[PDB]
Symmetry: D2
Subunit: 115 residues, 4 copies
């Protein structure tokens, strides 16, 4: 699988477990089409979202449902969700990890792209 | 009531001339254009909106990070940063949306004051 | 020439009353006390030093994050944040050391201007 | 092993490989005593630093040699190193991951503490 998502919780110092994640691919008419989705595991990771054959070049959006995550923990959040928008580009063999570190009023995201 | 500040984590400097587009969710659930501007030499974008215009709603602040890096000769990973939040639900607040940029990573924080 | 700004990522607010201790590496390779202060209501700490006092050197800015969280009733992970850098090596610069705090995580950024 | 270190590079979007990491434990006289050290692997991870028997409660410092990392990549850095200082506390079974995300003028660090 060429696309994985990993989510951490900066308040509790833990993987962010059971977070809903939706991936969209930008269509020709500029709308966002559902592409893959799931919930993070007990390790905060979401594997198996797509396959090499399905994951073609294009613009993708990863939407992480942070508001529901914080609400399930009883913590007051700022954002509706965290959004990560990027172009997939075929520069030799590549695997993409979209990582996010969550706080109630802040988040960070990094792309780890490896061969 | 809405200010945006952007920093560059490679240079340790304000991120100057970053385009920012703000949208507000309309009644038909689409993103309507709300305001736009660019960061100044200090990395700050003031004057996007007014107290009258900045009503309750769900807002999206799109920070055009790819255009920023490309103008510096760098090919970055992300298209833009997208900060989405419900504003003013318990009355007017002042929002500072801050972003810290690297070519393959960014962080964003909200400072909300009364 | 040296300012420290601290934000709280749980509240989306300035981190107020954060103690900050600055040290400078002495000729015997030990950390000598250089300056200290606390962040104001804006989360900013001004007036730590002067242009005359802030000579070249290796400086350590210790931000007392554990004391901050404990005063808010929270048990955090880190003892403090420690920002270590060589200053003024190519002439005087102005340094802003920023920190963004959560109970189990923090980030720190330097904004350096001439 | 109860203590692992993971380092990512925010400029290149990659694990931070071959980064020197030194762990110290605070001694009774308030000095920092060497405790463990190593270099991150091709995955940006440093495993096997210590054992359950050696890793007692106390105050620890993890020093990540970021300046040498950036210099090996030809990139101008701000910090001498990144320093992570924390108390280890025996609250049931615990494993500690100290994660760091590096940029030339900024770094972030998070603690992932799991059972
Ligand atoms: O108050 C500000 O002018 C301000 C603006 C930004 Cl953009 C940042 C900060 C402050 C800040 O403390 C900060 C701290 C740690 C990581 C990123 C940032 C920022 O990115
Ligand atoms: O799971 C990991 O091995 C791992 C290591 C690091 Cl170092 C990071 C992350 C994950 C991660 O999700 C992450 C998310 C947002 C900002 C920084 C990081 C990291 O810096
Ligand atoms: Ca291509
Ligand atoms: Ca309302
Ligand atoms: Ca010099
Ligand atoms: Ca104990």
């Amino acid at each position: 699988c060429p696309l994985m998502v990993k989510v951490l919780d900066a308040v509790r110092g833990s993987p962010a477990i059971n977070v809903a994640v939706h991936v969209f691919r930008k269509a020709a008419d500029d709308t966002w089409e559902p592409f893959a989705s799931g919930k993070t595991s007990e390790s905060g990771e979401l594997h198996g979202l797509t396959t090499e054959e399905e994951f073609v070049e294009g613009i993708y959006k990863v939407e992480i449902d942070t508001k529901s995550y914080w609400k399930a923990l009883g913590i007051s959040p700022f954002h509706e969700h965290a959004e990560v928008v990027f172009t997939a580009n075929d520069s030799g063999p590549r695997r993409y990890t979209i990582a996010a570190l969550l706080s109630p009023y802040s988040y960070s995201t990094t792309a780890v792209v490896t061969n």
